[PDB]
Amino acid sequence: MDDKALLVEVQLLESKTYHALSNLPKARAALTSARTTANAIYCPPKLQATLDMQSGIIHAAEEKDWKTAYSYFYEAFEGYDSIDSPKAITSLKYMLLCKIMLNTPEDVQALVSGKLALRYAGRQTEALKCVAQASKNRSLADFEKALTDYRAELRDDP
Amino acid sequence: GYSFSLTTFSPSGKLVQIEYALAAVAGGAPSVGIKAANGVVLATEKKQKSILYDERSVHKVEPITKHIGLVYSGMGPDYRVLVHRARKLAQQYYLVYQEPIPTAQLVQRVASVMQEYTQSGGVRPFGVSLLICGWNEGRPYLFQSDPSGAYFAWKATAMGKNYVNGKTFLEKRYNEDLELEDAIHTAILTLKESFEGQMTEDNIEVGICNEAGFRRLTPTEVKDYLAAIA
Amino acid sequence: GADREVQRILLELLNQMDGFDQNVNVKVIMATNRADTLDPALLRPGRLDRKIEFPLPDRRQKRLIFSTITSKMNLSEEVDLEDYVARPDKISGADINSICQESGMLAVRENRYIVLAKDFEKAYKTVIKKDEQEHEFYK
Amino acid sequence: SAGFDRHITIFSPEGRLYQVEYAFKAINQGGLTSVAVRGKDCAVIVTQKKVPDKLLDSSTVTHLFKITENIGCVMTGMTADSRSQVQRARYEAANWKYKYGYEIPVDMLCKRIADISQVYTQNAEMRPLGCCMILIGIDEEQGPQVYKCDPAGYYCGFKATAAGVKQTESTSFLEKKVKKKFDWTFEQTVETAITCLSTVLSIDFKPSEIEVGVVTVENPKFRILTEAEIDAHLVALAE
Amino acid sequence: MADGGSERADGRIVKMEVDYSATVDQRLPECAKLAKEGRLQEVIETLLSLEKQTRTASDMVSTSRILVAVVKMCYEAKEWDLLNENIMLLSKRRSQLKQAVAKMVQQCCTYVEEITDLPIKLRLIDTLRMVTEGKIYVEIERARLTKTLATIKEQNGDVKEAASILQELQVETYGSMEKKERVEFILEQMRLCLAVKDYIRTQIISKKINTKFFQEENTEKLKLKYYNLMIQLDQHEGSYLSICKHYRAIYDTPCIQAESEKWQQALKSVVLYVILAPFDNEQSDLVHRISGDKKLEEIPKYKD
Amino acid sequence: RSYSEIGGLSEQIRELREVIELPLTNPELFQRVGIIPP
């Protein structure tokens, strides 16, 4: 049929489940198919933001490139602004995580100083900030203490 | 070698000068026209080169009659010329038959006068293209006319600069059915698709064609629509 | 006469490109485009095969280009590139590099060692000039 | 491209009437400049007068014309063409007053001149008459009004404008001033205009070097300013 | 005219030393009428200069006869405003204005080091405002530098004082004719910035310091003495090697001076880097170079 | 095997100087700014 919106949604769900089961190439292919179908037809903003979030997650997981994953996360976050706080906060967390693992801890501060983040400032922001600092001083222990303090921070992703 | 005089034929195809006038039309201000279920909407970008210019001075959507709007793309002076001509024709028809000009007749008369300038001689053809609203007999109408003298009949279109993107977005979004307000939202969206710089109550002109007569929207209403997302 | 020489050149090129089995996987890249004058002879599978588009840097790409170019910069730490990234208007990569260069020159002009935000704003305004003449007709 | 489409008023690939384009360069050919401004309850025109030879009746050399008792005009570009356009404008104003029974609003007159120019550019066998025109007037319930034409047939209303060789710099300076918040009282308007012209030209002109013409709501009559009054304004501007 | 202006001034000096308030607006009209004339330009420039000298007399009477520096601002406004009518293409009468400003500064130094901080501050501010467009001829903005040096001395180089001096003399861009004294005053800029207690902004200024070249070996050695100062200005900012570089630079002077101690101090400075200088190839070469100096071994510390 | 032969050179001794010699002396300044000198 022609309900291309639902087709895109189911394509994204397929990609998410494939990644959860860890079949990366199949998740990537399903994501690309979803992107093509979305580009074919009209898409609301939440759908586009979710698709971009999934794309960024996949791009990070493959680990091949990070800047692209970072940008995809940023777009998903900006879109989720004002509409999906639950998704926006997670997107900000991924922003911080990708930036930290980009061996560029310093700029993390600027990100949490961004006006948009301030409204979303919360426990997770400081958790990521202290983790980034620990990485900055290059102490295995600093890292461990931070991990111990924020179990919830570690729960989401391996 | 040819493509200088509007008289001679190409050694194969068709006159060129008319095509060049069409090209001049293409490189003009964006314009958008949506035929809603119960009305028509016309929108156009109106940006001045600086803040000195007065935005309430010259308009780009004008009422030809109580129920026939009109927007243009391309050169301006030609737009003034043929808007004057169209008003004259509508009045002549009303005098003769004592009834408002049905839109299709106005469109074809305007097309005839427009093609009149493409005949031989030094008289260069119009470098503008026109979109006409209209709500006679109980159903909205939306026509397009061009220097060639042909007149189409769109359901929803966009002309001027970056018209390809507007057309793509239109066929993506507008399905068949909307009211005047949703049509307006779609139209302003389409303009934004290619519009440059932040849109304001003064950057763009919007007009509607209902069952109360064609009417241009005041800055307050267009600001209100510009607000509320979209 | 003297007009068919270019056609002779193009035909020689087509013959060499397709020609014979002298393959040695000698790849060819063409970066002159807006392909309407391109002969279908030198446009076909077996001929130049992969057609790849290079659109205007869009949103989520202007940010990547800005970050990449500004990587090595004094970075006053007060200019938010997000303002330009999310801002409207179409700007190509050459223009973005020019904007950064001119912001740096504006900063150095006032003996300012680290480029500051107003310098970036001035550079952005300067680089955006559109037609810059128009004639108030052609709309 | 250029080389064939450069002799007659016919279209070119990437539609471009080159002749009308050249008309504007002709306008600049005069070697003069002018600036108009619109105040709260007044409108002012300023131009620079250049008498090169003493053997010349300075009075007879002028660029401010009185189109009608209330509507004033300033011309720029080729002199003879400007005079012809001025005469046409006077004719049209008279005809309007005769036919419809009230003084022609400034905008309508500007529109008429623009239409004449357009019809000239469309059909061949008439030069585009390369002179640019600025009109100032007072419109009841609308306040002061400034309008500008061009040989191409395009026209528009302005809050402040320039014409001539230094058009771009003058308009940039005027925009800089206007984005600032001013009341623009009569004295303020004249000071602004003269300052803009001086700064663009960097001349600090003497009172015989420029002409000024102002129309005010209190006295809608378009009055050409006299040397004593302009000198007083200039010294006051110097403070 | 020349005779008219001369007689007017030389006769009305006595007539105006009695009147104080209404006196000024009697030469104001004749000053205006003289300025409006342009027959001679050069000679009328001299007449206007004489008129401005009489204005300076009005000013020193104002400082003395009546409240100190209470009407000088009015004089400056008058000679900035009435000027406009005859500064055609910003020329001529501006030259006369600065010719008068020469005497203005000649007396403003006396005002500054004679009168208290308030009137001199006001007078310096007014003359500076008068010379904002005035380029650095020999002292135009150097007057500003001297005034700010006075201020920093008075309040003892506040952080805002250091900022003011450094910005004022950074305004001294490549527009000062006197390169030599320009060097001599970028010296004071370096001194102030180093006194800022940063070593970082000190490095920033050290940029333009290095932009200066050949501060040494200059004729008559005065710049060389200035060289000493800048060579002396080099400090911890200069690494433990650079210190030996500039110490060797300064070591040229004491041998000329044959000083009993400070020359010994210079030799000790150029020899003591070694302990501060980490070992390397170039350090070895330069220690070999310095080694073997008879004047050096005179100190037992060399043997140690 | 004359500094000023055109009379008034303020325009010449100004932007031209500031864009000709400034990039000729201290490449460290610009490379630290990260901008290639004009």
From Swiss-Prot, chain B:
InterPro entries registered for this protein in UniProt: Ntn_hydrolases_N (IPR029055), Proteasome_alpha (IPR050115), Proteasome_alpha-type (IPR023332), Proteasome_asu_N (IPR000426), Proteasome_sua/b (IPR001353)
Keyword Phosphoprotein among record annotations: yes
Reported induction: Down-regulated by antioxidants BO-653 and probucol. Down-regulated in response to enterovirus 71 (EV71) infection (at protein level).
First-listed, main subcellular location of the protein, grouped into a coarse class: cytoplasm
Positions of modified residues (Phosphoserine): 3, 10, 12
GO BP annotations listed: proteasome-mediated ubiquitin-dependent protein catabolic process; response to virus
Keywords: Acetylation, Cytoplasm, Nucleus, Phosphoprotein, Proteasome
Domain of life: Eukaryota
Keyword Lipid metabolism among record annotations: no
PTM entry text: Phosphorylated on tyrosine residues; which may be important for nuclear import.
Modified residues (N6-acetyllysine): 66, 167
SMART domains: Proteasome_A_N
Oligomer and partners: The 26S proteasome consists of a 20S proteasome core and two 19S regulatory subunits. The 20S proteasome core is a barrel-shaped complex made of 28 subunits that are arranged in four stacked rings. The two outer rings are each formed by seven alpha subunits, and the two inner rings are formed by seven beta subunits. The proteolytic activity is exerted by three beta-subunits PSMB5, PSMB6 and PSMB7.
Family, as annotated: Belongs to the peptidase T1A family.
Name of the protein described by the UniProt record: Proteasome subunit alpha type-2
Curated annotation (Swiss-Prot), chain D:
Disulfide bonds: none
Keywords, in A-Z order: Acetylation, Cytoplasm, Glycoprotein, Nucleus, Phosphoprotein, Proteasome
Residues with N6-acetyllysine modification: 97, 99
CDD domains: proteasome_alpha_type_6 (cd03754)
Modified residues (Phosphoserine): 12, 58-59
Residue numbers of Phosphotyrosine PTMs: 154
UniProt xrefs under PANTHER family: PROTEASOME SUBUNIT ALPHA/BETA (PTHR11599)
Role summary: Component of the 20S core proteasome complex involved in the proteolytic degradation of most intracellular proteins. This complex plays numerous essential roles within the cell by associating with different regulatory particles. Associated with two 19S regulatory particles, forms the 26S proteasome and thus participates in the ATP-dependent degradation of ubiquitinated proteins.
Name the UniProt record assigns to this protein: Proteasome subunit alpha type-6
Gene this chain is encoded by: PSMA6
From Swiss-Prot, chain E:
The keyword Ubl conjugation belongs to this UniProt entry's keyword annotation: yes
Keywords per UniProt: Acetylation, Intellectual disability, Isopeptide bond, Proteasome, Ubl conjugation
GO BP: proteasome-mediated ubiquitin-dependent protein catabolic process
UniProt GO cellular component terms: cytoplasm; cytosol; extracellular exosome; extracellular region; ficolin-1-rich granule lumen; membrane; nucleoplasm; proteasome accessory complex
Sites bearing N6-acetyllysine, chain numbering: 221
Linked residues for Glycyl lysine isopeptide (Lys-Gly) (interchain with G-Cter in SUMO2): 92
Signal peptide: none
Glycyl lysine isopeptide (Lys-Gly) (interchain with G-Cter in SUMO1) crosslink, residue number(s): 92
Positions carrying N-acetylalanine: 2
Binding partners and assembly: Component of the 19S proteasome regulatory particle complex. The 26S proteasome consists of a 20S core particle (CP) and two 19S regulatory subunits (RP). The regulatory particle is made of a lid composed of 9 subunits including PSMD12, a base containing 6 ATPases and few additional components. Interacts with ERCC6.
Disease per UniProt entry: Stankiewicz-Isidor syndrome: A neurodevelopmental disorder characterized by delayed psychomotor development, intellectual disability, behavioral disorders, mild dysmorphism, ophthalmologic anomalies, feeding difficulties, deafness, and variable congenital malformations of the cardiac and/or urogenital systems.
Family (UniProt): Belongs to the proteasome subunit p55 family.
Full protein name: 26S proteasome non-ATPase regulatory subunit 12
Swiss-Prot record, chain F:
Highest taxon, organism lineage: Eukaryota
Organism of origin: Homo sapiens
Localization of this protein: Cytoplasm; Nucleus
UniProt record similarity statement: Belongs to the AAA ATPase family.
Chain's role: Component of the 26S proteasome, a multiprotein complex involved in the ATP-dependent degradation of ubiquitinated proteins. This complex plays a key role in the maintenance of protein homeostasis by removing misfolded or damaged proteins, which could impair cellular functions, and by removing proteins whose functions are no longer required. Therefore, the proteasome participates in numerous cellular processes, including cell cycle progression, apoptosis, or DNA damage repair.
Subunit details: Component of the 19S proteasome regulatory particle complex. The 26S proteasome consists of a 20S core particle (CP) and two 19S regulatory subunits (RP). The regulatory particle is made of a lid composed of 9 subunits, a base containing 6 ATPases including PSMC6 and few additional components. Interacts with PAAF1.
Designated name of the protein: 26S proteasome regulatory subunit 10B
